[PDB]
Amino acid sequence: KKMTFQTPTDPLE
Amino acid sequence: ATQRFLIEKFSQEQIGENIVCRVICTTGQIPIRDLSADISQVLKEKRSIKKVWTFGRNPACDYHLGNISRLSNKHFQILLGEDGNLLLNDISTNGTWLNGQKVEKNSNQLLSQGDEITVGVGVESDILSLVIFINDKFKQCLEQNKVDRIR
Incomplete structure (x- = not known):
């Protein structure tokens, strides 16, 4: 499958 | 003689009888909504939370947002x-x-x-x-009406 993300969470913790 | 009655309408409906707080978007994106909680329920509850609002892009959320991917279903509560x-x-x-x-x-x-x-x-x-x-x-109602010990 191939689609676009929904909630672009900034890479972090 | 309803002379005084006509004056009563002057003040109109007094806001703050149950309406806890209101959320207004300043950036112009989400439609202003009204959050409220019943006083009787608040005074009756002497533990934990009374009523909580959930805000986000979800139609379930107590607050319906516009449509920002950066925001979550229930961004805030x-x-x-x-x-x-x-x-x-x-x-x-x-x-x-x-x-x-x-x-x-x-x-x-x-x-x-x-x-x-x-x-x-x-x-x-x-x-x-x-x-x-x-x-x-x-806040006036809450202060004017303390829990337990009625005067």
Whole structure:
């Protein structure tokens, strides 16, 4: 499958 | 003679009988909504929270947002209880902001008068701000009516 993300969470913790 | 009656209408409906607080978007994105809680329920409850609002892009959320991917289904939540004041609970995947200062997620914070919550932080053009309006009338009832020990 191939689609676009929904909630672009900034890479972090 | 309803001379006085005509004056009663002058004051009109008094706001703050149940309406806890109101959320107003300053950046012009989400439609202003009204958050409320029943006093009887608040006075009857002497433990835990009374009523909490959930805000986000989800139609379930007590607050319907526009459509920002940066924001989560239930970006933020507001709880009312403890003693009488209000609490702000952030519940976003990306985080909730207060006047530019990011608060601890799912954390209780002491609400502020005309405060503002910023969300969608990450990109200068991907941030959305909100404003919280609190009525003093609501506080009056709580103060005028203390829990237990009726006078």
